[PDB]
């Protein structure tokens with residue numbers, strides 16, 4: 001009822017901004033998440049005791065991998081929170097419940113390997129799920145945790161609202177498969193430009209939410225440059241581990257995953273800001289003007305990678 005979460009002043013202020021970094025104090029991340037559910041949804045969205053137990057079961061099922069870890073999940077939920085808070089009146093009650101949860105859960109039980117590696121390794125999960133292999137697993141792990149005893153944070157919904165929210169979560173996690181992003185963004189681009197984009201059209205809303213998921217998932221690129229840089233190192237730590245495993249399967253990895261080709265990182269960053277990041281936040285800005293700060297920050301980081309390449313760092 002009356003038991004607000006409250007954050008220190010610097011955090012209380014800076015958490016509202018897109019570029020906020022959640023800090024190195026793991027013990028504070030659960031409290032940050034709850035704070036954001038309470039402001040984004042209401043103190044009355046979730047039974048606190050259930051929410052707390054869900055969060056701690058979610059955290060327990062992230063692994064100790066350089067990038068795809070509990071910090072990443074909480075980072076991705078904070079970017080979603082800042083989008084929701086900036087676009088108050090665009091989303092439903094169900095959407096605001098579903099999407100923070102979806103984001104906290106979107107990489108559950110990730111091992112640091114790509115859908116590619118699972119498929120080339122011939123991992124069991126590539127037999128159960130032949131595309132978006134990991135993302136189908138991350139959805140499946142979310143349903144498992146929701147069905148633990150005392151873990152149904154959705155217990156007050158009806159049969160159909162519950163089914164709607166779980167359907168919001170499932171699409172939202174699947175959309176974090178970057179292979180799906182390109183086609184999603186192009187259709188949104190064609191729709192927005194021709195004026196056919198329609199936010200009572202559920203198939204259009206799904207597209208838009210998928211684009212939000214990509215934006216939150218990649219939100220590394222929208223931080224202050226030192227966060228961006230030190231995050232990049234965790235990303236590459238995983239990719240080069242996967243490359244070492246590709247070499248052990250007797251397969252020359254893609255350069256992105258080859259630690260011997262570290263020199264070309266700056267160039268690959270530009271490619272990715274140009275081919276993925278910037279177009280994502282550009283299209284996001286057009287559909288939701290108040291997310292422009294993500295585009296601006298992303299552009300500032302593109303310029304940092306250019307400086308790296310001109311040897312000015």
Ligand SMILES: Cn1ncc(C(=O)N2CCC2)c1C(=O)N[C@@H]1CCn2cc(-c3ccccc3)nc2C1
Nearest residue numbers: 178218220221235255256261262264265268269272
């Ligand atoms: C920042 N960010 N955030 C999430 C992701 C991301 O793609 N994923 C999947 C899991 C997260 C990234 C990222 O930067 N991805 C780039 C993709 C293409 N590319 C090519 C090279 C590259 C090419 C030749 C030599 C050296 C390096 N480096 C990259 C990194």
Ligand SMILES: [Mg+2]
Nearest residue numbers: 106107176177
């Ligand atoms: Mg993922």
Ligand SMILES: [Zn+2]
Nearest residue numbers: 106107176217
């Ligand atoms: Zn992710």
